[PDB]
Structure formats: C-alpha cells, structure tokens
Design a binder for this molecule. Structure first.
Ligand SMILES: */C(=C\C(=O)OCC)[C@H](C[C@@H]1CCNC1=O)NC(=O)[C@@H](NC(=O)[C@@H](NC(=O)OC(C)(C)C)C(C)C)c1ccccc1
Ligand SMILES: */C(=C\C(=O)OCC)[C@H](C[C@@H]1CCNC1=O)NC(=O)[C@@H](NC(=O)[C@@H](NC(=O)OC(C)(C)C)C(C)C)c1ccccc1
Lengths: 302, 301
C-alpha cells in the first residue's frame, strides 16, 4: 500500500565513500577492497577542463599526487591507472566495509539509488532512473562528483553509475563503474546537448499497474489497443516506443491485477490524450515513469 | 530537485528482526535496548483490541527472539512503553550511532528506512502530514520500520511504523511509543482526518526554487497572512501562521523575499495555476520540503 519513490538502503555504499583530492580538486570516490574509483577529471586543472588530455594530464601525476581520504584518515594511494573516464587508485588498506559488489552498466529506463556525496561524505540518497537520453534527472551540486549510482540485490551492491557532469539542461551525466559514460558525453566542459528525452513507457505502465495493485482503478477503460496503435499515440506524446519485450516484462504485473498489458496501454493512451481530468493517480498529477516494473513488483507484492 | 533521504547507513545498523511467537517485525536496536511495536506480542486472535498490558505480562524474555544477521540477541529484559516494547538485550549494539528520540511535528519531514524481517529494504523521504499520518509505502512485515532525521552525525529517531489507515496512509508513534495523531495500535475503525497542503513547506519549496533560479512566479506585490489564508483555505492549504513565517526566515533572508511576498506569489500560483509552467521541474506545488530541508539540498550538507 502507499507508493514512494523508494531508494535502496545506502548503508553499504556509504562505507565505500571517500574523498579523493588531486591538486586543488576534490570529489568523491568509491573504495572497494584496495581500490578507489573516481572521475578521472579530478586530475583536471581548472583551465584544463576546456579540452583536457587525460593520458597526458595523468602521466604527469603520481601515486602521491592523489589525496584519498577515508573519513578523516588519509588513505595511502600506492598505484593508479585510468580506465576510460575513471581513475582506479590502488591503496594500501582494504576497506573492511566493502560490501559484496558487482559493477553493472544499466540500461536506459532502469532505476537505481544515488548516494549524493560531498567530500567523500554521504549527504543524501534518492532513487532515480537512467533517463532515456542517458542523463539522470537528479539533485547534484558542485562537489557531488564521484557520487555513485547503485542497486542492491539482497546484499550484493550493483554499482551502475558514477557522477561526472551537469548538462546545461539541468540534468546530470555520469559513467558506469568502468568509466564509460552513459549517453554521448565526455569528460570535457564543451557544449553537450542532453539528448532528446522521452518518457519511459515501460515504467509508466509499471506505475499504473502499481496504482491498480494498490486499489486505484479509475484510469482503466474497456478500450484496448494494438501495440502499434498505442505507440502511434505514445510517440506523439513523446513516450519511448513500447516493444513486445516491454509487455513481456509487464507480464507478472499483468497477471497480478489481471489486466492485459495492451489494455493498460489502452488506459495509458486515454490518459495521455484526455489528461488526468486534474485527478490524480497514486498521488501524482502526472504519469510517473521512474519506477521500473521490477521496482513496482518489489514495492507492492511483499 | 528530488526528495532526498538521509543516508540510511546509521539506522541500517540499528535494524533488527523481532520475533514473538508467530509475529515477526523490525526492531530498532539502540544500545542494550531493542524498540519495536508492542503489537509484536499479538496474532490473529488478539488484534481487534488486544490488552497489551495483560498480553505482555504473560510473555517472558524467552518469548522474544531479537535477531541481527545470523546472530540472536538474548533478550534479558522487557517492558512496554506506551505502544512500544523496550527489550533489554544482553548486547549493546556496536553500530549504535549518536541518537535522539524526537517527536516530529506535523509538516516536518524525515527519512523512513522501510524494513522487513529485520532487514532494511528501501529508504524514502516523507512528511508527517497535517492529519498526522504519512504518505509512506509499507507492506506487511514493515512494522518497526523507523523514520529519522540526521543532524550532523546524530540520528533523530522520530518515527516507528505501526498502523496503515484504510486511506492507504500510515500511522506510527515516536520512539516513546506515543502515537502521532488520534490513532491507536488496534484493529478499530479509525480514519485519518482529511489532509491539507503543508503551506509552510510549499513556501519553503518556492524559496528553494528562487534559490535555484526559478523565480518566474514571484510578483511585485505582497499580501497579509490573513488574506493569504483566505485563498489557501480554498485550495485546502494549512493556514500559514506567524510561527510558520518565522520558520521561513532563513530562506526569506537568503533570497530577501518576505514570506508574505512569497505568499502573494503562491496566492497567484494557486488562483492561476502554473499555466504549463514548472517550478523546480515539478508541475505541482511540493509540500514535503520543510524550510530546513530546502537548506540541506541547496546548501550542501
Ligand atoms: C562534479 C565536480 C566535483 O565534484 O568537483 C569538485 C571540485 C560536477 C557536478 C555538477 C555540479 C552541478 N551539478 C552537477 O551535476 N562536476 C562538474 O562541475 C562538471 N561540470 C559540468 O558538467 C558542466 N558541464 C558542461 O559545461 O557541459 C556543457 C554545458 C558545455 C554541455 C556544467 C557545470 C555546466 C565537471 C566537468 C568536467 C570536469 C569536472 C567537473
Ligand atoms: C506492521 C505489522 C507487522 O510488522 O506485522 C508483522 C507480522 C503493519 C504494517 C501495515 C502493513 C501494510 N501497511 C502497513 O502500514 N502492522 C499491521 O498490519 C497493522 N495493521 C493495520 O494497521 C490495519 N489497520 C486497520 O485495520 O485500521 C482500520 C482499517 C480498522 C482503521 C491495516 C493493515 C488495514 C496492525 C494490526 C494490528 C495490530 C497492530 C498493527
């Protein structure tokens, strides 16, 4: 019952947040075992951000060029390397609080928790989704960089995102724990259109099923709609095209609630076209798409 | 600008599973004490209206099974404090963070670490609604889940989950076992009073917008706290009081926009809607960001 944009317990991720400083640049880092990840752009001098040559800027650095700090104790960096847009600083001590973890490049539309950090210190956690344009509509300020995006599968933390940029659109862009950006962005402060955004159709349906699982039903109709017709409409409303895989995914949620995916699609279509009569769905006044089908099934069943 | 929750690390280390017979729920393990809903000592038979006092006096420490991981905390004492059970355990939680028990006030917010069988499952931010309930997300077995605020390094435990009003909302108690609202921890037929918009927070929010550069809604005029309330009344807004105004002060000072001025702005935001316009991204007027919260996210904490 009830429905919140729920984030995973950030506890296990906090125990891996550290401060990493190079020159006068300081940002967050992930310290797992004997390694610390952070946006390689930490080595970027001010003026060096217009068009930095990381390979060049890094070679001019050394282990001691990095001031990695765990809380208030200085971590000794005894090895460093670059992996795409990351810095993999090896340290001498191994973080005893390193949770069971895995690095995963999430798929646009998927959701994850973000531990907003500043100076290697957890400031807040929020759940967000990998927007369709690969950016993340988040709340980040200067110094949030190095914050990690993660998921928790029981006790195994899946790091999927590491903050890096701030597209002018006000959104945010980062990398996966392997340094590869999400979207067509780069470690440069150079014009970067935060690509055409779309509404995650998959999630809005998952969300609508959630509202239904929770008793709300007013938006349903006797109408139905082919996958193709739903798309012809949805796309007009700037919605991600809905694929058969998506409806397969909504399968479970379809069963429970007993509503056929396209029927729900028929409801979504109506909503899009008739607006919400001012009325609300599961609280919101606008179709929510930051809850994946998996999220919903996890927050409604048990 | 998203609704952020305090990192739940500290509370996570204080969540334990409390079992009593067939009833299992979450327990807050601070020091040598484990707090959990007193209805942990219930079951299908004694719920409509259990006599806890009696029901507990029939239970002994061996009745309770407090667990943390694959560890079992021998319970060496048990007392009931209002609607909570204070369970003394033979072990003082090593992860106990500096903590206070503070009874939150309507409108104020806090993070909620939703738990299941002693395990933290998810953490979200919410507000203690005017009607005294919370638009949270809880499923069976979430009981004992705690709400909290973090002041520097101190955890301010302000909420513990117990009931779920038919409204789809939730009632709980502070960590002293006293319920927030008229609600009780019984299967009565209690209903949440109608809710209102936390005017104070909407305001705080608008300010936050102004702080981030979203000020299209401001206006040249002002209004009287009285005149504003006549509007707010229509849109079912909490009547703004001078105490509310003073609470906004910092935000008001930072942006130099007088509360009554911002109300004037909110007045027209209510009477003319946002005409397709968005404040801080949203299309609706957020009322779950207290003045203090607005600071947190904007003035990094
Ligand atoms: C994190 C940097 C950090 O922690 O530094 C501490 C000293 C950010 C966070 C960014 C701040 C506000 N919200 C955010 O998400 N890192 C940056 O400031 C980066 N800045 C940008 O992304 C800029 N992007 C940009 O110029 O792109 C175009 C507008 C040209 C398309 C923003 C601020 C305009 C950053 C980039 C590169 C290196 C270091 C930092
Ligand atoms: C936590 C109990 C727990 O941990 O039990 C583990 C076995 C809840 C959480 C509740 C679950 C779903 N969302 C929630 O908020 N404890 C209860 O189930 C309690 N149930 C209620 O509060 C019921 N309220 C109720 O009937 O109120 C009226 C409709 C009569 C006004 C809900 C579920 C309808 C609960 C029941 C009995 C004693 C103590 C708590």
């Amino acid at each position: 019952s009830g429905f919140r944009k729920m984030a995973f317990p950030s506890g296990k991720v906090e125990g891996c947040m550290v401060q990493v400083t190079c020159g006068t640049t300081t940002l967050n880092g992930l310290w797992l075992d004997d390694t610390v990840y952070c946006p390689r752009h930490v080595i970027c001098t001010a003026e060096d951000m217009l068009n930095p040559n990381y390979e060049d800027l890094l070679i001019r650095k050394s282990n001691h060029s990095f001031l990695v700090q765990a809380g208030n104790v200085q971590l000794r960096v005894i090895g460093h390397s670059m992996q795409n847009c990351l810095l993999r600083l090896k340290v001498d001590t191994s973080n005893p609080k390193t949770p069971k973890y895995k690095f995963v490049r999430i798929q646009p539309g998927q959701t994850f928790s973000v531990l907003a950090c500043y100076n290697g210190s957890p400031s807040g956690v929020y759940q967000c989704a990998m927007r369709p344009n690969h950016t993340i509509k988040g709340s980040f300020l200067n110094g949030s960089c190095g914050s990690v995006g993660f998921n928790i599968d029981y006790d195994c933390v899946s790091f999927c995102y590491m903050h890096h940029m701030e597209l002018p659109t006000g959104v945010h862009a980062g990398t996966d724990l392997e340094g590869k950006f999400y979207g067509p962005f780069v470690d440069r402060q150079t014009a970067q259109a935060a690509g055409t955004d779309t509404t995650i159709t998959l999630n809005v349906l998952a969300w609508l099923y959630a509202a239904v699982i929770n008793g709300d039903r007013w938006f349903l109709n006797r109408f139905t709609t082919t996958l193709n017709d739903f798309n012809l409409v949805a796309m007009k409303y700037n919605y991600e095209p809905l694929t058969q895989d998506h409806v397969d995914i909504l399968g479970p949620l379809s069963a429970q609630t007993g509503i056929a995916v396209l029927d729900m699609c028929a409801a979504l279509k109506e909503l899009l076209q008739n607006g919400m009569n001012g009325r609300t769905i599961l609280g919101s006044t606008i179709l929510e798409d930051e809850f994946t089908p998996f999220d919903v099934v996890r927050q409604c069943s048990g």
